[PDB]
PDB file of all heavy atoms in Angstrom:
ATOM      1  N   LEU B  63     -11.890  -1.872 -49.828  1.00  0.00           N
ATOM      2  CA  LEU B  63     -12.906  -0.910 -50.236  1.00  0.00           C
ATOM      3  C   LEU B  63     -12.197   0.204 -50.989  1.00  0.00           C
ATOM      4  O   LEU B  63     -11.317   0.870 -50.433  1.00  0.00           O
ATOM      5  CB  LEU B  63     -13.673  -0.355 -49.030  1.00  0.00           C
ATOM      6  CG  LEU B  63     -14.947   0.487 -49.225  1.00  0.00           C
ATOM      7  CD1 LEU B  63     -15.567   0.793 -47.880  1.00  0.00           C
ATOM      8  CD2 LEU B  63     -14.741   1.790 -49.983  1.00  0.00           C
ATOM      9  N   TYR B  64     -12.584   0.409 -52.244  1.00  0.00           N
ATOM     10  CA  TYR B  64     -11.976   1.447 -53.062  1.00  0.00           C
ATOM     11  C   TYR B  64     -12.658   2.784 -52.805  1.00  0.00           C
ATOM     12  O   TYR B  64     -13.889   2.880 -52.839  1.00  0.00           O
ATOM     13  CB  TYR B  64     -12.072   1.082 -54.543  1.00  0.00           C
ATOM     14  CG  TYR B  64     -11.077   0.035 -54.991  1.00  0.00           C
ATOM     15  CD1 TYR B  64     -11.500  -1.112 -55.649  1.00  0.00           C
ATOM     16  CD2 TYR B  64      -9.717   0.195 -54.759  1.00  0.00           C
ATOM     17  CE1 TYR B  64     -10.597  -2.074 -56.062  1.00  0.00           C
ATOM     18  CE2 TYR B  64      -8.806  -0.762 -55.169  1.00  0.00           C
ATOM     19  CZ  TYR B  64      -9.252  -1.894 -55.819  1.00  0.00           C
ATOM     20  OH  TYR B  64      -8.351  -2.849 -56.230  1.00  0.00           O
ATOM     21  N   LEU B  65     -11.856   3.814 -52.546  1.00  0.00           N
ATOM     22  CA  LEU B  65     -12.350   5.178 -52.376  1.00  0.00           C
ATOM     23  C   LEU B  65     -11.593   6.076 -53.343  1.00  0.00           C
ATOM     24  O   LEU B  65     -10.402   6.339 -53.146  1.00  0.00           O
ATOM     25  CB  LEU B  65     -12.180   5.660 -50.936  1.00  0.00           C
ATOM     26  CG  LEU B  65     -13.122   5.048 -49.898  1.00  0.00           C
ATOM     27  CD1 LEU B  65     -12.579   5.243 -48.492  1.00  0.00           C
ATOM     28  CD2 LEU B  65     -14.516   5.634 -50.026  1.00  0.00           C
ATOM     29  N   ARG B  66     -12.278   6.542 -54.382  1.00  0.00           N
ATOM     30  CA  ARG B  66     -11.681   7.384 -55.408  1.00  0.00           C
ATOM     31  C   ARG B  66     -12.146   8.823 -55.239  1.00  0.00           C
ATOM     32  O   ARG B  66     -13.317   9.075 -54.939  1.00  0.00           O
ATOM     33  CB  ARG B  66     -12.044   6.881 -56.809  1.00  0.00           C
ATOM     34  N   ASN B  67     -11.218   9.760 -55.431  1.00  0.00           N
ATOM     35  CA  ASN B  67     -11.495  11.194 -55.370  1.00  0.00           C
ATOM     36  C   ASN B  67     -12.175  11.566 -54.051  1.00  0.00           C
ATOM     37  O   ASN B  67     -13.330  11.995 -54.007  1.00  0.00           O
ATOM     38  CB  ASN B  67     -12.337  11.633 -56.573  1.00  0.00           C
ATOM     39  CG  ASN B  67     -12.389  13.139 -56.731  1.00  0.00           C
ATOM     40  OD1 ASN B  67     -13.358  13.785 -56.331  1.00  0.00           O
ATOM     41  ND2 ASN B  67     -11.342  13.708 -57.318  1.00  0.00           N
ATOM     42  N   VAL B  68     -11.427  11.389 -52.962  1.00  0.00           N
ATOM     43  CA  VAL B  68     -11.973  11.632 -51.633  1.00  0.00           C
ATOM     44  C   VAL B  68     -12.155  13.127 -51.412  1.00  0.00           C
ATOM     45  O   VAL B  68     -11.324  13.946 -51.828  1.00  0.00           O
ATOM     46  CB  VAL B  68     -11.064  11.018 -50.556  1.00  0.00           C
ATOM     47  CG1 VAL B  68     -11.325   9.524 -50.439  1.00  0.00           C
ATOM     48  CG2 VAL B  68      -9.601  11.292 -50.873  1.00  0.00           C
ATOM     49  N   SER B  69     -13.250  13.488 -50.755  1.00  0.00           N
ATOM     50  CA  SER B  69     -13.577  14.869 -50.431  1.00  0.00           C
ATOM     51  C   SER B  69     -13.601  15.042 -48.915  1.00  0.00           C
ATOM     52  O   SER B  69     -13.354  14.103 -48.154  1.00  0.00           O
ATOM     53  CB  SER B  69     -14.918  15.272 -51.053  1.00  0.00           C
ATOM     54  N   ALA B  70     -13.909  16.267 -48.480  1.00  0.00           N
ATOM     55  CA  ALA B  70     -13.923  16.562 -47.050  1.00  0.00           C
ATOM     56  C   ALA B  70     -14.996  15.757 -46.328  1.00  0.00           C
ATOM     57  O   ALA B  70     -14.791  15.310 -45.194  1.00  0.00           O
ATOM     58  CB  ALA B  70     -14.132  18.059 -46.825  1.00  0.00           C
ATOM     59  N   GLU B  71     -16.148  15.557 -46.971  1.00  0.00           N
ATOM     60  CA  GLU B  71     -17.220  14.769 -46.376  1.00  0.00           C
ATOM     61  C   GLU B  71     -16.916  13.277 -46.362  1.00  0.00           C
ATOM     62  O   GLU B  71     -17.651  12.520 -45.718  1.00  0.00           O
ATOM     63  CB  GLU B  71     -18.531  15.018 -47.123  1.00  0.00           C
ATOM     64  N   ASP B  72     -15.861  12.838 -47.051  1.00  0.00           N
ATOM     65  CA  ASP B  72     -15.532  11.419 -47.107  1.00  0.00           C
ATOM     66  C   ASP B  72     -14.757  10.943 -45.887  1.00  0.00           C
ATOM     67  O   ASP B  72     -14.761   9.741 -45.601  1.00  0.00           O
ATOM     68  CB  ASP B  72     -14.730  11.117 -48.375  1.00  0.00           C
ATOM     69  CG  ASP B  72     -15.617  10.895 -49.585  1.00  0.00           C
ATOM     70  OD1 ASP B  72     -16.810  10.575 -49.398  1.00  0.00           O
ATOM     71  OD2 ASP B  72     -15.122  11.043 -50.722  1.00  0.00           O
ATOM     72  N   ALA B  73     -14.095  11.845 -45.169  1.00  0.00           N
ATOM     73  CA  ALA B  73     -13.346  11.453 -43.987  1.00  0.00           C
ATOM     74  C   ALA B  73     -14.294  11.140 -42.832  1.00  0.00           C
ATOM     75  O   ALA B  73     -15.481  11.475 -42.851  1.00  0.00           O
ATOM     76  CB  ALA B  73     -12.366  12.550 -43.578  1.00  0.00           C
ATOM     77  N   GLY B  74     -13.750  10.493 -41.813  1.00  0.00           N
ATOM     78  CA  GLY B  74     -14.507  10.113 -40.646  1.00  0.00           C
ATOM     79  C   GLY B  74     -14.154   8.704 -40.229  1.00  0.00           C
ATOM     80  O   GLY B  74     -13.083   8.195 -40.553  1.00  0.00           O
ATOM     81  N   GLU B  75     -15.075   8.073 -39.508  1.00  0.00           N
ATOM     82  CA  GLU B  75     -14.864   6.726 -38.997  1.00  0.00           C
ATOM     83  C   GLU B  75     -15.467   5.707 -39.954  1.00  0.00           C
ATOM     84  O   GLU B  75     -16.631   5.828 -40.348  1.00  0.00           O
ATOM     85  CB  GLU B  75     -15.489   6.574 -37.611  1.00  0.00           C
ATOM     86  CG  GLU B  75     -15.411   5.170 -37.043  1.00  0.00           C
ATOM     87  CD  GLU B  75     -15.924   5.095 -35.619  1.00  0.00           C
ATOM     88  OE1 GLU B  75     -16.438   6.117 -35.117  1.00  0.00           O
ATOM     89  OE2 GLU B  75     -15.823   4.013 -35.003  1.00  0.00           O
ATOM     90  N   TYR B  76     -14.672   4.708 -40.323  1.00  0.00           N
ATOM     91  CA  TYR B  76     -15.127   3.599 -41.147  1.00  0.00           C
ATOM     92  C   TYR B  76     -15.038   2.311 -40.340  1.00  0.00           C
ATOM     93  O   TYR B  76     -14.152   2.150 -39.496  1.00  0.00           O
ATOM     94  CB  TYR B  76     -14.300   3.483 -42.437  1.00  0.00           C
ATOM     95  CG  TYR B  76     -14.607   4.555 -43.464  1.00  0.00           C
ATOM     96  CD1 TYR B  76     -14.391   5.899 -43.183  1.00  0.00           C
ATOM     97  CD2 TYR B  76     -15.106   4.223 -44.716  1.00  0.00           C
ATOM     98  CE1 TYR B  76     -14.669   6.881 -44.117  1.00  0.00           C
ATOM     99  CE2 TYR B  76     -15.384   5.200 -45.657  1.00  0.00           C
ATOM    100  CZ  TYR B  76     -15.166   6.525 -45.352  1.00  0.00           C
ATOM    101  OH  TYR B  76     -15.444   7.496 -46.286  1.00  0.00           O
ATOM    102  N   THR B  77     -15.969   1.395 -40.598  1.00  0.00           N
ATOM    103  CA  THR B  77     -16.084   0.176 -39.811  1.00  0.00           C
ATOM    104  C   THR B  77     -16.322  -1.013 -40.731  1.00  0.00           C
ATOM    105  O   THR B  77     -16.984  -0.896 -41.766  1.00  0.00           O
ATOM    106  CB  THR B  77     -17.221   0.284 -38.782  1.00  0.00           C
ATOM    107  OG1 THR B  77     -17.092   1.511 -38.055  1.00  0.00           O
ATOM    108  CG2 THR B  77     -17.177  -0.878 -37.799  1.00  0.00           C
ATOM    109  N   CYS B  78     -15.770  -2.160 -40.341  1.00  0.00           N
ATOM    110  CA  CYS B  78     -15.911  -3.416 -41.071  1.00  0.00           C
ATOM    111  C   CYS B  78     -16.781  -4.352 -40.238  1.00  0.00           C
ATOM    112  O   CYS B  78     -16.353  -4.822 -39.179  1.00  0.00           O
ATOM    113  CB  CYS B  78     -14.538  -4.031 -41.342  1.00  0.00           C
ATOM    114  SG  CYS B  78     -14.498  -5.336 -42.590  1.00  0.00           S
ATOM    115  N   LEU B  79     -18.001  -4.621 -40.708  1.00  0.00           N
ATOM    116  CA  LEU B  79     -18.934  -5.498 -40.003  1.00  0.00           C
ATOM    117  C   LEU B  79     -18.875  -6.898 -40.598  1.00  0.00           C
ATOM    118  O   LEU B  79     -19.285  -7.114 -41.743  1.00  0.00           O
ATOM    119  CB  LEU B  79     -20.365  -4.967 -40.057  1.00  0.00           C
ATOM    120  CG  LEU B  79     -20.802  -3.922 -39.033  1.00  0.00           C
ATOM    121  CD1 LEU B  79     -22.315  -3.749 -39.086  1.00  0.00           C
ATOM    122  CD2 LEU B  79     -20.356  -4.318 -37.639  1.00  0.00           C
ATOM    123  N   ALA B  80     -18.383  -7.846 -39.808  1.00  0.00           N
ATOM    124  CA  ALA B  80     -18.492  -9.266 -40.097  1.00  0.00           C
ATOM    125  C   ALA B  80     -19.454  -9.895 -39.101  1.00  0.00           C
ATOM    126  O   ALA B  80     -19.420  -9.575 -37.909  1.00  0.00           O
ATOM    127  CB  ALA B  80     -17.129  -9.958 -40.018  1.00  0.00           C
ATOM    128  N   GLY B  81     -20.313 -10.783 -39.589  1.00  0.00           N
ATOM    129  CA  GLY B  81     -21.276 -11.436 -38.724  1.00  0.00           C
ATOM    130  C   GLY B  81     -21.647 -12.804 -39.252  1.00  0.00           C
ATOM    131  O   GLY B  81     -21.487 -13.104 -40.439  1.00  0.00           O
ATOM    132  N   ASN B  82     -22.143 -13.636 -38.344  1.00  0.00           N
ATOM    133  CA  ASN B  82     -22.609 -14.969 -38.695  1.00  0.00           C
ATOM    134  C   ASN B  82     -23.821 -15.295 -37.831  1.00  0.00           C
ATOM    135  O   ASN B  82     -24.459 -14.403 -37.263  1.00  0.00           O
ATOM    136  CB  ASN B  82     -21.469 -15.993 -38.566  1.00  0.00           C
ATOM    137  CG  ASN B  82     -20.990 -16.187 -37.130  1.00  0.00           C
ATOM    138  OD1 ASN B  82     -21.782 -16.326 -36.200  1.00  0.00           O
ATOM    139  ND2 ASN B  82     -19.674 -16.210 -36.952  1.00  0.00           N
ATOM    140  N   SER B  83     -24.140 -16.588 -37.735  1.00  0.00           N
ATOM    141  CA  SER B  83     -25.317 -17.010 -36.987  1.00  0.00           C
ATOM    142  C   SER B  83     -25.201 -16.670 -35.509  1.00  0.00           C
ATOM    143  O   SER B  83     -26.214 -16.429 -34.845  1.00  0.00           O
ATOM    144  CB  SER B  83     -25.539 -18.512 -37.171  1.00  0.00           C
ATOM    145  OG  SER B  83     -24.912 -19.255 -36.138  1.00  0.00           O
ATOM    146  N   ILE B  84     -23.981 -16.636 -34.979  1.00  0.00           N
ATOM    147  CA  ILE B  84     -23.774 -16.429 -33.548  1.00  0.00           C
ATOM    148  C   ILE B  84     -23.751 -14.948 -33.193  1.00  0.00           C
ATOM    149  O   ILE B  84     -24.465 -14.507 -32.286  1.00  0.00           O
ATOM    150  CB  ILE B  84     -22.478 -17.135 -33.100  1.00  0.00           C
ATOM    151  N   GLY B  85     -22.945 -14.157 -33.883  1.00  0.00           N
ATOM    152  CA  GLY B  85     -22.827 -12.758 -33.538  1.00  0.00           C
ATOM    153  C   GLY B  85     -22.054 -11.976 -34.573  1.00  0.00           C
ATOM    154  O   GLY B  85     -21.988 -12.358 -35.743  1.00  0.00           O
ATOM    155  N   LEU B  86     -21.468 -10.867 -34.124  1.00  0.00           N
ATOM    156  CA  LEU B  86     -20.760  -9.952 -35.006  1.00  0.00           C
ATOM    157  C   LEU B  86     -19.437  -9.536 -34.380  1.00  0.00           C
ATOM    158  O   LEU B  86     -19.237  -9.632 -33.166  1.00  0.00           O
ATOM    159  CB  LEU B  86     -21.595  -8.701 -35.315  1.00  0.00           C
ATOM    160  CG  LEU B  86     -23.058  -8.912 -35.699  1.00  0.00           C
ATOM    161  CD1 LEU B  86     -23.963  -8.513 -34.554  1.00  0.00           C
ATOM    162  CD2 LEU B  86     -23.388  -8.110 -36.942  1.00  0.00           C
ATOM    163  N   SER B  87     -18.533  -9.062 -35.235  1.00  0.00           N
ATOM    164  CA  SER B  87     -17.246  -8.524 -34.822  1.00  0.00           C
ATOM    165  C   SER B  87     -16.903  -7.352 -35.728  1.00  0.00           C
ATOM    166  O   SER B  87     -17.137  -7.409 -36.939  1.00  0.00           O
ATOM    167  CB  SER B  87     -16.142  -9.587 -34.888  1.00  0.00           C
ATOM    168  OG  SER B  87     -16.309 -10.565 -33.876  1.00  0.00           O
ATOM    169  N   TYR B  88     -16.353  -6.289 -35.144  1.00  0.00           N
ATOM    170  CA  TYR B  88     -16.097  -5.075 -35.904  1.00  0.00           C
ATOM    171  C   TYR B  88     -14.831  -4.393 -35.409  1.00  0.00           C
ATOM    172  O   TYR B  88     -14.572  -4.338 -34.204  1.00  0.00           O
ATOM    173  CB  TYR B  88     -17.280  -4.103 -35.814  1.00  0.00           C
ATOM    174  CG  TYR B  88     -17.856  -3.946 -34.424  1.00  0.00           C
ATOM    175  CD1 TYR B  88     -17.338  -3.010 -33.537  1.00  0.00           C
ATOM    176  CD2 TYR B  88     -18.921  -4.729 -34.000  1.00  0.00           C
ATOM    177  CE1 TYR B  88     -17.863  -2.861 -32.266  1.00  0.00           C
ATOM    178  CE2 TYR B  88     -19.453  -4.589 -32.731  1.00  0.00           C
ATOM    179  CZ  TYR B  88     -18.919  -3.653 -31.869  1.00  0.00           C
ATOM    180  OH  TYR B  88     -19.443  -3.510 -30.604  1.00  0.00           O
ATOM    181  N   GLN B  89     -14.053  -3.872 -36.356  1.00  0.00           N
ATOM    182  CA  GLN B  89     -12.885  -3.050 -36.072  1.00  0.00           C
ATOM    183  C   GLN B  89     -13.009  -1.758 -36.865  1.00  0.00           C
ATOM    184  O   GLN B  89     -13.356  -1.786 -38.050  1.00  0.00           O
ATOM    185  CB  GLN B  89     -11.585  -3.777 -36.431  1.00  0.00           C
ATOM    186  N   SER B  90     -12.731  -0.633 -36.215  1.00  0.00           N
ATOM    187  CA  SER B  90     -12.939   0.679 -36.808  1.00  0.00           C
ATOM    188  C   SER B  90     -11.613   1.390 -37.043  1.00  0.00           C
ATOM    189  O   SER B  90     -10.645   1.207 -36.299  1.00  0.00           O
ATOM    190  CB  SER B  90     -13.837   1.546 -35.919  1.00  0.00           C
ATOM    191  OG  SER B  90     -15.169   1.064 -35.914  1.00  0.00           O
TER     192      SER B  90
END
Side-chain angles (χ1 to χ4, degrees), chain B residues 63-65 67-68 70 72-83 85-88 90:
Chain B
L63 191 175
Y64 283 126
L65 287 162
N67 193 261
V68 280
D72 276 339
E75 176 175 6
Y76 286 62
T77 310
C78 195
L79 276 191
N82 66 46
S83 93
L86 314 106
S87 290
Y88 44 87
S90 290

